[PDB]
Design a protein around this nucleic acid. Structure first.
Ligand code: MG
Ligand code: MG
Ligand code: MG
Ligand code: MG
Ligand code: MG
Ligand code: MG
Ligand code: MG
Ligand code: MG
Ligand code: MG
Ligand code: MG
Ligand code: MG
Ligand code: MG
Ligand code: MG
Ligand code: MG
Ligand code: MG
Ligand code: MG
Ligand code: MG
Ligand code: MG
Ligand code: MG
Ligand code: MG
Ligand code: MG
Ligand code: MG
Ligand code: MG
Ligand code: MG
Ligand code: MG
Ligand code: MG
Ligand code: MG
Ligand code: MG
Ligand code: MG
Ligand code: MG
Ligand code: MG
Ligand code: MG
Ligand code: MG
Ligand code: MG
Ligand code: MG
Ligand code: MG
Ligand code: MG
Ligand code: MG
Ligand code: MG
Ligand code: MG
Ligand code: MG
Ligand code: MG
Ligand code: MG
Ligand code: MG
Ligand code: MG
Ligand code: MG
Ligand code: MG
Ligand code: MG
Ligand code: MG
Ligand code: MG
Ligand code: MG
Ligand code: MG
Ligand code: MG
Ligand code: MG
Ligand code: MG
Ligand code: MG
Ligand code: MG
Ligand code: MG
Ligand code: MG
Ligand code: MG
Ligand code: MG
Ligand code: MG
Ligand code: MG
Ligand code: MG
Ligand code: MG
Ligand code: MG
Ligand code: MG
Ligand code: MG
Ligand code: MG
Ligand code: MG
Ligand code: MG
Ligand code: MG
Ligand code: MG
Ligand code: MG
Ligand code: MG
Ligand code: MG
Ligand code: MG
Ligand code: MG
Ligand code: MG
Ligand code: MG
Ligand code: MG
Ligand code: MG
Ligand code: MG
Ligand code: MG
Ligand code: MG
Ligand code: MG
Ligand code: MG
Ligand code: MG
Ligand code: MG
Ligand code: MG
Ligand code: MG
Ligand code: MG
Ligand code: MG
Ligand code: MG
Ligand code: MG
Ligand code: MG
Ligand code: MG
Ligand code: MG
Ligand code: MG
Ligand code: MG
Ligand code: MG
Ligand code: MG
Ligand code: MG
Ligand code: MG
Ligand code: MG
Ligand code: MG
Ligand code: MG
Ligand code: MG
Ligand code: MG
Ligand code: MG
Ligand code: MG
Ligand code: MG
Ligand code: MG
Ligand code: MG
Ligand code: MG
Ligand code: MG
Ligand code: MG
Ligand code: MG
Ligand code: MG
Ligand code: MG
Ligand code: MG
Ligand code: MG
Ligand code: MG
Ligand code: MG
Ligand code: MG
Ligand code: MG
Ligand code: MG
Ligand code: MG
Ligand code: MG
Ligand code: MG
Ligand code: MG
Ligand code: MG
Ligand code: MG
Ligand code: MG
Ligand code: MG
Ligand code: MG
Ligand code: MG
Ligand code: MG
Ligand code: MG
Ligand code: MG
Ligand code: MG
Ligand code: MG
Ligand code: MG
Ligand code: MG
Ligand code: MG
Ligand code: MG
Ligand code: MG
Ligand code: MG
Ligand code: MG
Ligand code: MG
Ligand code: MG
Ligand code: MG
Ligand code: MG
Ligand code: MG
Ligand code: MG
Ligand code: MG
Ligand code: MG
Ligand code: MG
Ligand code: MG
Ligand code: MG
Ligand code: MG
Ligand code: MG
Ligand code: MG
Ligand code: MG
Ligand code: MG
Ligand code: MG
Ligand code: MG
Ligand code: MG
Ligand code: MG
Ligand code: MG
Ligand code: MG
Ligand code: MG
Ligand code: MG
Ligand code: MG
Ligand code: MG
Ligand code: MG
Ligand code: MG
Ligand code: MG
Ligand code: MG
Ligand code: MG
Ligand code: MG
Ligand code: MG
Ligand code: MG
Ligand code: MG
Ligand code: MG
Ligand code: MG
Ligand code: MG
Ligand code: MG
Ligand code: MG
Ligand code: MG
Ligand code: MG
Ligand code: MG
Ligand code: MG
Ligand code: MG
Ligand code: MG
Ligand code: MG
Ligand code: MG
Ligand code: MG
Ligand code: MG
Ligand code: MG
Ligand code: MG
Ligand code: MG
Ligand code: MG
Ligand code: MG
Ligand code: MG
Ligand code: MG
Ligand code: MG
Ligand code: MG
Ligand code: MG
Ligand code: MG
Ligand code: MG
Ligand code: MG
Ligand code: MG
Ligand code: MG
Ligand code: MG
Ligand code: MG
Ligand code: MG
Ligand code: MG
Ligand code: MG
Ligand code: MG
Ligand code: MG
Ligand code: MG
Ligand code: MG
Ligand code: MG
Ligand code: MG
Ligand code: MG
Ligand code: MG
Ligand code: MG
Ligand code: MG
Ligand code: MG
Ligand code: MG
Ligand code: MG
Ligand code: MG
Ligand code: MG
Ligand code: MG
Ligand code: MG
Ligand code: MG
Ligand code: MG
Ligand code: MG
Ligand code: MG
Ligand code: MG
Ligand code: MG
Ligand code: MG
Ligand code: MG
Ligand code: MG
Ligand code: MG
Ligand code: MG
Ligand code: MG
Ligand code: MG
Ligand code: MG
Ligand code: MG
Ligand code: MG
Ligand code: MG
Ligand code: MG
Ligand code: MG
Ligand code: MG
Ligand code: MG
Ligand code: MG
Ligand code: MG
Ligand code: MG
Ligand code: MG
Ligand code: MG
Ligand code: MG
Ligand code: MG
Ligand code: MG
Lengths: 48, 275
RNA sequence: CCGAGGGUAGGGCCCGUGACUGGGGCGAAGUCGUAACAAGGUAGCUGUACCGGAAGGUGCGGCUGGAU
RNA sequence: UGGGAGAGGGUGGUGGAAUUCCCGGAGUAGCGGUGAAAUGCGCAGAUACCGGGAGGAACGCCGAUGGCGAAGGCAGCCACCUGGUCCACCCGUGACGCUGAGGCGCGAAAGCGUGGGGAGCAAACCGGAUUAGAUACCCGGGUAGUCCACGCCCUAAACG
RNA sequence: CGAUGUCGGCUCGUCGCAUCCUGGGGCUGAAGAAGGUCCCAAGGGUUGGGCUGUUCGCCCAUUAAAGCGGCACGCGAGCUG
RNA sequence: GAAUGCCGGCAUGAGUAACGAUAAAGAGGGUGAGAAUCCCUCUCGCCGUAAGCCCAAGGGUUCCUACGCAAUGGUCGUCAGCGUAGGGUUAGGCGGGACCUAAGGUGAAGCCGAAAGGCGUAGCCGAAGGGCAGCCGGUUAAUAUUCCGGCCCUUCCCGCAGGUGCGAUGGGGGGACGCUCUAGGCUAGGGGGACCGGAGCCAUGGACGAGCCCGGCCAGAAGCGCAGGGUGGGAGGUAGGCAAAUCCGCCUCCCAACAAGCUCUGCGUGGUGGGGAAGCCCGGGUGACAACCCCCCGAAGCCAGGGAGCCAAGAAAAGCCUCUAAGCACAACCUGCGGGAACCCGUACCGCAAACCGACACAGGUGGGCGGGUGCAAGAGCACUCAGGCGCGCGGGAGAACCCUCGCCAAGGAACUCUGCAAGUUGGCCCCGUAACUUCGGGAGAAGGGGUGCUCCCUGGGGUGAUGAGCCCCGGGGAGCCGCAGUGAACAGGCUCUGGCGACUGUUUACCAAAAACACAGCUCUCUGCGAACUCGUAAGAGGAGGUAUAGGGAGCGACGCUUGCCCGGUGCCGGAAGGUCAAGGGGAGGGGUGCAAGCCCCGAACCGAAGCCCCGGUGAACGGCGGCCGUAACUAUAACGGUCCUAAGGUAGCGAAAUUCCUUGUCGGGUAAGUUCCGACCUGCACGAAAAGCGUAACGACCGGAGCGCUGUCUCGGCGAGGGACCCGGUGAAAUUGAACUGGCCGUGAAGAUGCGGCCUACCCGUGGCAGGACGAAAAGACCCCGUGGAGCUUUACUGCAGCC
RNA sequence: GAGCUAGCCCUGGCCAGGGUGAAGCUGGGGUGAGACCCAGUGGAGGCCCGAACCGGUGGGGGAUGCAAACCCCUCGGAUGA
């Protein structure tokens, strides 16, 4: 049947992307945490 | 009259449709239509705040002249009577000798070709608008303003009308469509005659589909739900109300008055509605 | 080929009969009240409507085939 | 052809008395109702009186033993549209007539449908009396209905 | 109770005997035929159907007879549900 | 040494299950160390509304070539979407951006919120919508509307010529729209040709033929032709389109009007450039100077912004045109022409799938376009087949049980079983014919029956032509032929009688329930006068609604028909300026602490003082409720009638052993040989009953009962046959589970059901195919049940708070 | 976290073929005029049959699956909520 992952690049960037995270208090804390932990990618990589 | 159907489907057996006899023109004036932003019953937070709305036929909004004292003394010709999907009344296209074009809602008995005009000096004839203080006691009237220059608010639906019952000071006394007796300021404008399409209320929708075309989505009873949903929810099998009948939000819904008691307009309302 | 008829199927009319049920007639030696005939004790009768154990009542309109 | 009388019919408008309700005043100990009563209403101010308003229904006197219509039936006043009928002239037609199974139409009240309207009255219903009892008669309440439109119903002591 | 799956049916049997039938007996209120009642006897046999989930039971048509029990009310790592 | 402990390693099950659609393979040749598995050829099979082709998403080098085979690939591997390396994606016209707006998002002004932040008309962002200029062929191993060739085209800049009051983010027009049906004329696509081109063929009995086989086109500016779309012209007046306006709107007058004209698109033609088959020969050559024509069918596509009808009444903004304002009028704009200029990103490949979503090369899921031919009435259905693509990444044997999927069956025909579950039967089209009942539509494909192929002869109408031939469509009549059988294969209702529930089409527990549940038109109650009520939010602000009582919210009931009684004492709600009770506050009789004092401070009675409650009344389609005992009639039986206790009042109409009836399989009647079910009745209704509606109701139902006809392997009662497994051989190779085991029966015993204890009996050692009685077999620290002063959801006249409201 | 799912909003798209034959319209009949009746025309509908498409009724298979919901046969809707 139809499963839960239905990839869509605009949806990915518009939801989890860097500018989305920057817009909001929780989103900025996400970035701060991810940078503090040393994540190589702060945000999901999307081809665009 | 309303149009009936032969029972060639289970739904055409009861379905009735308006005859549309008064309508002379089937396209709206392009300069007076604008898109209606459909809401689905959702507010600016995106939340349903009026339940069971949406999915109705697309409509354009015809701009309606509910002011009318905008053009005192300037007569106009009744050019057309048109269908308006946004209201129960029909609309009438006015061609002012100004060259300006406007819609008013159509009174009963209005004639394409007839002249109408607004003002203190307007004749007491169907389609004319005057301040309430210059309309004779007893004449039935519609598109009534509630305060001066704020716009017509009263007696706007199909077949409705208010009647002038007398004068008292700067106020006239109207019987509203609801039977209520209320004072309205004499400088409020009104249009002599009653609203047209009085057959409107004899329409039989006929099937669930017709309600859906109007944007009315199905209404599910509180008794059909569960306790988390509604006071009437739950019970094994069917259940009577088992408590005074309530809304989804808990307030009683068989008699409980809800008008705010200290409201300033109480000073102007003489007798609450009848029936 | 037609063809007595036999067969399959589906209709129409009539008669007999049926758990049970509706009222009708007669019987009369019963129980209940007394509706009508006298102004019959609320004048009567009436079409209809609603109602009551029962006769009947009441409403609306009508007739006199109503006493004073 | 020229006249007549008439609640004959349909539509629209419109007038006054009265009942009820609401508002304002004035005012107080009862009012109402009956054969007599009680229920009911009333000191939370009724009834009786004055003023204002709203609303429906029916039209006092004229009115009669009267008039009109085929019958059912028709009653304030005005206008419009409209039917039947009588009289005088003896002008025109030339038996064109009478009746009439079927058909078609009209058809009091009650009742029905859809929608209005709702003052008074009032089936059902509730209460009070009456009474041996009183699912009645009498009394206090009271919903359909009674009224308007449209569509049905098609009955009668629809009788002379 | 860190699980011993349950009624009834189907299938497959096997056992007990307080024996329904068939075999052998005594008593009889056993003339005969047919029964009654007790004793021996478990080798084999013990039908098809209507009703109802039913076991049971009632009924139809037969039969030599249409037995009663046990096996985790035998049998769901065999089926049904 | 144990914690169903944690991490790791390694065992058991076991050479076992399995190797992922039953579309299918065989041989020959080659390559190589090695070949069922790679390449080549021939034969065979499968898809063909796809299992072929194109596009968008998503994926991200998987594309091409060379060289490889450790791992990956369910076997193998010389092969590969794998390893290494090199190469490959070319645009003014295709898509997106340097254009527009939609929901929405953001957000000058502005509003609100402890902070963070929430709103917010304009503006801006936002597309798969609007707008906008490229078609055909060729070329690479791999890109092509991008490179090349031919023929076209757009915008910007500049210059020239001609023309005009030029000029805008401002005004106006336009853009600009639904659903269903549909005209004319075309094109795509298709079929036929005795005609045109073509390599060849003559088999095996016949045919040198009007034979077979193959092909018979594509793009194209101007002009022209055909078919359509769009649009009236002139003048005068002018107070409206938030300045102006000559534009637009409105009024009047005159020509024109279903015309033409002007304009725009489509199709045809069109200079020109292309393409071009079978067969044969080694992707290429040849065929070939290829031919490139006629007829018929024909779109759902085009002309298009076409037409008609209907109600549910069907985006915006820019590009475009027109008007004018500042301005500027040596400019500027318009038209023609010419030269110059013309950027950024995508482009490979997979794309119904082995490259995307599902951990897998996973029988699942994935939007748009093309989707040929013949026959079956039609069609995208079904059978076959073209182009194209495939045989599904383990095989070879064997011919047991058993399992799956499938075929047939004597006699019987539901006897099966909870149930005809399942499977038969029926089955398309044409004709004949068709009942109760009904809301007059239906029920209805009711039921039931007849026809169906091929040949010859005659004949009726239509389409295209031309009016005719030809072609193509729809027919009618007569006579015959064959078979067991003519929708000869595939696709394609079994039917009826009668109850319950729900009116109906719909909706639902994604993944055990599709229903009688939800919804539904419709009915009623009730709230709401507009800054409505109500809802969300602390608020601002929103929805309601750019609506206004014929409207909006809440509640119940649930088409329709006939109806919906009695009880207002309790609770609810509504009304009630009296009265009672009532908090803060007011008031301050009186009393107190302290001070030498003036004074400071504290307590405090009467009285005034809201909502609420009490109190009076109304109210049921508001919550709800709707009795008992005794007696009495010509036999018995019963009780119309009377008495009496209680109640707020004692269940009306209708229905009733019912989706409700315990006793119960009530009784009686029907159906059956037999009927705990079913249907019809009765009424002692344990415990129906009137909008949690009562009783009916045509039609409808993958709902749940009962019966019959037809037909059957459901069964008596089973037999045979088919293929995929199971079995054997070669290749690869799991699993849960597992204290260790050298693991028999009985009768006993034992924590009460023993392979393991006692006694006895039986028993050589080890496997393979099978069956499931036991190992209280496996799985999941029992869901039941209880316990825990464990949890959570829900309720209320439990407690106590809070919002909200008064 | 609404790339699954539920609802709404904006903007696009899709639904072979066949059957039934409402209103309206024209003609005719009818009447004082009508109602109405008949025929032709017409093409309505939460109409009918049936692919795509959307479903998930009954049975069977599957059950360390092809699959953490699949397969086969059968069945519901298919211009509409
Ligand atoms: Mg996942
Ligand atoms: Mg998706
Ligand atoms: Mg992805
Ligand atoms: Mg995307
Ligand atoms: Mg996107
Ligand atoms: Mg997205
Ligand atoms: Mg982002
Ligand atoms: Mg990481
Ligand atoms: Mg790094
Ligand atoms: Mg992140
Ligand atoms: Mg009208
Ligand atoms: Mg109708
Ligand atoms: Mg109709
Ligand atoms: Mg009709
Ligand atoms: Mg019907
Ligand atoms: Mg119907
Ligand atoms: Mg109409
Ligand atoms: Mg109209
Ligand atoms: Mg606009
Ligand atoms: Mg709007
Ligand atoms: Mg918003
Ligand atoms: Mg938001
Ligand atoms: Mg939010
Ligand atoms: Mg809503
Ligand atoms: Mg309208
Ligand atoms: Mg209407
Ligand atoms: Mg209605
Ligand atoms: Mg609508
Ligand atoms: Mg509703
Ligand atoms: Mg509902
Ligand atoms: Mg529920
Ligand atoms: Mg919740
Ligand atoms: Mg709660
Ligand atoms: Mg609750
Ligand atoms: Mg409840
Ligand atoms: Mg309950
Ligand atoms: Mg419930
Ligand atoms: Mg329930
Ligand atoms: Mg219950
Ligand atoms: Mg319920
Ligand atoms: Mg229910
Ligand atoms: Mg209730
Ligand atoms: Mg309850
Ligand atoms: Mg209760
Ligand atoms: Mg409230
Ligand atoms: Mg006001
Ligand atoms: Mg014979
Ligand atoms: Mg008497
Ligand atoms: Mg009398
Ligand atoms: Mg009675
Ligand atoms: Mg009685
Ligand atoms: Mg009475
Ligand atoms: Mg009379
Ligand atoms: Mg008189
Ligand atoms: Mg007289
Ligand atoms: Mg004469
Ligand atoms: Mg009458
Ligand atoms: Mg009457
Ligand atoms: Mg009446
Ligand atoms: Mg008595
Ligand atoms: Mg009544
Ligand atoms: Mg009534
Ligand atoms: Mg008389
Ligand atoms: Mg246990
Ligand atoms: Mg365990
Ligand atoms: Mg266990
Ligand atoms: Mg003897
Ligand atoms: Mg003995
Ligand atoms: Mg003995
Ligand atoms: Mg024996
Ligand atoms: Mg034995
Ligand atoms: Mg039995
Ligand atoms: Mg029993
Ligand atoms: Mg018995
Ligand atoms: Mg015998
Ligand atoms: Mg036993
Ligand atoms: Mg036991
Ligand atoms: Mg027991
Ligand atoms: Mg057992
Ligand atoms: Mg047993
Ligand atoms: Mg068992
Ligand atoms: Mg089992
Ligand atoms: Mg069992
Ligand atoms: Mg077991
Ligand atoms: Mg077992
Ligand atoms: Mg069973
Ligand atoms: Mg069960
Ligand atoms: Mg230890
Ligand atoms: Mg373990
Ligand atoms: Mg373990
Ligand atoms: Mg461990
Ligand atoms: Mg571990
Ligand atoms: Mg080992
Ligand atoms: Mg082996
Ligand atoms: Mg083994
Ligand atoms: Mg090989
Ligand atoms: Mg090899
Ligand atoms: Mg090969
Ligand atoms: Mg094939
Ligand atoms: Mg094909
Ligand atoms: Mg990937
Ligand atoms: Mg490539
Ligand atoms: Mg390898
Ligand atoms: Mg290898
Ligand atoms: Mg190797
Ligand atoms: Mg491998
Ligand atoms: Mg694999
Ligand atoms: Mg090699
Ligand atoms: Mg590979
Ligand atoms: Mg290279
Ligand atoms: Mg180019
Ligand atoms: Mg630029
Ligand atoms: Mg943009
Ligand atoms: Mg775009
Ligand atoms: Mg473009
Ligand atoms: Mg071109
Ligand atoms: Mg290339
Ligand atoms: Mg528009
Ligand atoms: Mg559009
Ligand atoms: Mg549609
Ligand atoms: Mg062409
Ligand atoms: Mg063809
Ligand atoms: Mg030869
Ligand atoms: Mg042409
Ligand atoms: Mg002007
Ligand atoms: Mg060639
Ligand atoms: Mg050549
Ligand atoms: Mg040549
Ligand atoms: Mg089409
Ligand atoms: Mg409408
Ligand atoms: Mg439009
Ligand atoms: Mg806009
Ligand atoms: Mg200037
Ligand atoms: Mg110019
Ligand atoms: Mg740039
Ligand atoms: Mg680039
Ligand atoms: Mg490319
Ligand atoms: Mg591939
Ligand atoms: Mg698929
Ligand atoms: Mg594979
Ligand atoms: Mg796959
Ligand atoms: Mg093709
Ligand atoms: Mg066929
Ligand atoms: Mg066919
Ligand atoms: Mg099909
Ligand atoms: Mg072919
Ligand atoms: Mg294969
Ligand atoms: Mg394979
Ligand atoms: Mg073998
Ligand atoms: Mg198969
Ligand atoms: Mg047989
Ligand atoms: Mg049979
Ligand atoms: Mg038979
Ligand atoms: Mg059955
Ligand atoms: Mg068939
Ligand atoms: Mg019948
Ligand atoms: Mg009929
Ligand atoms: Mg038939
Ligand atoms: Mg039938
Ligand atoms: Mg033949
Ligand atoms: Mg055959
Ligand atoms: Mg087939
Ligand atoms: Mg069929
Ligand atoms: Mg069957
Ligand atoms: Mg039947
Ligand atoms: Mg029912
Ligand atoms: Mg239903
Ligand atoms: Mg239902
Ligand atoms: Mg019904
Ligand atoms: Mg319903
Ligand atoms: Mg329904
Ligand atoms: Mg449907
Ligand atoms: Mg579930
Ligand atoms: Mg489910
Ligand atoms: Mg689940
Ligand atoms: Mg679930
Ligand atoms: Mg299931
Ligand atoms: Mg379900
Ligand atoms: Mg269903
Ligand atoms: Mg549901
Ligand atoms: Mg429901
Ligand atoms: Mg109803
Ligand atoms: Mg709300
Ligand atoms: Mg709130
Ligand atoms: Mg706001
Ligand atoms: Mg709005
Ligand atoms: Mg609003
Ligand atoms: Mg609004
Ligand atoms: Mg509104
Ligand atoms: Mg419902
Ligand atoms: Mg009826
Ligand atoms: Mg009663
Ligand atoms: Mg009460
Ligand atoms: Mg009360
Ligand atoms: Mg009372
Ligand atoms: Mg209570
Ligand atoms: Mg007083
Ligand atoms: Mg003091
Ligand atoms: Mg009522
Ligand atoms: Mg109570
Ligand atoms: Mg109640
Ligand atoms: Mg009762
Ligand atoms: Mg009973
Ligand atoms: Mg019943
Ligand atoms: Mg039930
Ligand atoms: Mg009961
Ligand atoms: Mg019981
Ligand atoms: Mg019972
Ligand atoms: Mg029982
Ligand atoms: Mg019985
Ligand atoms: Mg049964
Ligand atoms: Mg049963
Ligand atoms: Mg009884
Ligand atoms: Mg309820
Ligand atoms: Mg119920
Ligand atoms: Mg159904
Ligand atoms: Mg169903
Ligand atoms: Mg068998
Ligand atoms: Mg065979
Ligand atoms: Mg076999
Ligand atoms: Mg085989
Ligand atoms: Mg075999
Ligand atoms: Mg061997
Ligand atoms: Mg050992
Ligand atoms: Mg043991
Ligand atoms: Mg033992
Ligand atoms: Mg042992
Ligand atoms: Mg031991
Ligand atoms: Mg030992
Ligand atoms: Mg020992
Ligand atoms: Mg031992
Ligand atoms: Mg032994
Ligand atoms: Mg075993
Ligand atoms: Mg065991
Ligand atoms: Mg053991
Ligand atoms: Mg076991
Ligand atoms: Mg066991
Ligand atoms: Mg645990
Ligand atoms: Mg436990
Ligand atoms: Mg437990
Ligand atoms: Mg557990
Ligand atoms: Mg559970
Ligand atoms: Mg326990
Ligand atoms: Mg405790
Ligand atoms: Mg404790
Ligand atoms: Mg808790
Ligand atoms: Mg759209
Ligand atoms: Mg469709
Ligand atoms: Mg026709
Ligand atoms: Mg028409
Ligand atoms: Mg349909
Ligand atoms: Mg259908
Ligand atoms: Mg879906
Ligand atoms: Mg299924
Ligand atoms: Mg089946
Ligand atoms: Mg099967
Ligand atoms: Mg299974
Ligand atoms: Mg499947
Ligand atoms: Mg299937
Ligand atoms: Mg089917
Ligand atoms: Mg269908
Ligand atoms: Mg269809
Ligand atoms: Mg249809
Ligand atoms: Mg439908
Ligand atoms: Mg729609």
């Amino acid at each position: 049947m139809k499963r839960t992952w239905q990839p869509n690049r605009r949806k990915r960037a518009k939801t989890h992307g860097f500018r989305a995270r920057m817009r909001t208090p929780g989103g900025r804390k996400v970035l701060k945490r991810r940078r503090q932990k040393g994540r190589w990618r702060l945000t999901p990589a999307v081809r665009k | 009259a309303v149009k009936k159907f032969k029972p060639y489907t289970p739904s055409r057996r009861f379905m009735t449709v308006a005859d549309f006899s008064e309508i002379t023109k089937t396209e709206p004036e392009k300069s007076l239509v604008k898109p209606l932003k459909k809401t689905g019953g959702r507010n600016n937070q995106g939340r349903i705040t009026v339940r069971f709305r949406g999915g109705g036929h697309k409509r354009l909004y015809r701009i309606i002249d509910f002011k009318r004292w905008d053009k005192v003394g300037i007569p106009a010709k009744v050019a057309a009577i048109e269908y308006d999907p946004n209201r129960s009344a029909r609309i009438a296209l006015l061609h002012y000798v100004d060259g300006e074009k406007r819609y008013i809602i159509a009174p009963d008995g209005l004639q394409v070709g007839q002249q109408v005009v607004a003002g203190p000096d307007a004749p007491i004839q169907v389609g004319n608008a005057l301040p309430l203080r210059f309309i004779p006691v007893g004449t039935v009237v519609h598109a009534v303003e509630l305060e001066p220059k704020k716009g017509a608010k009263l007696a706007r639906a199909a077949g409705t009308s208010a009647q002038i019952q007398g004068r008292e000071g700067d106020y006239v006394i109207l019987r509203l469509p609801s039977g209520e007796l209320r004072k309205v300021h004499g400088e409020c404008y009104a249009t002599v005659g009653a609203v047209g399409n009085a057959d409107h209320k004899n329409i039989v929708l006929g099937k669930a589909g017709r309600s859906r075309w109007l944007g009315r989505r199905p209404h599910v009873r509180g008794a059909a739900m569960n306790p988390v949903d509604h006071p009437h929810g739950g019970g094994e099998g069917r259940a009577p109300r088992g408590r005074p009948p309530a809304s989804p939000w808990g307030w009683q819904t068989k008699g409980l008055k809800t008008r705010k008691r200290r409201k300033p307009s109480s000073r102007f309302i003489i007798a609450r509605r009848k029936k």
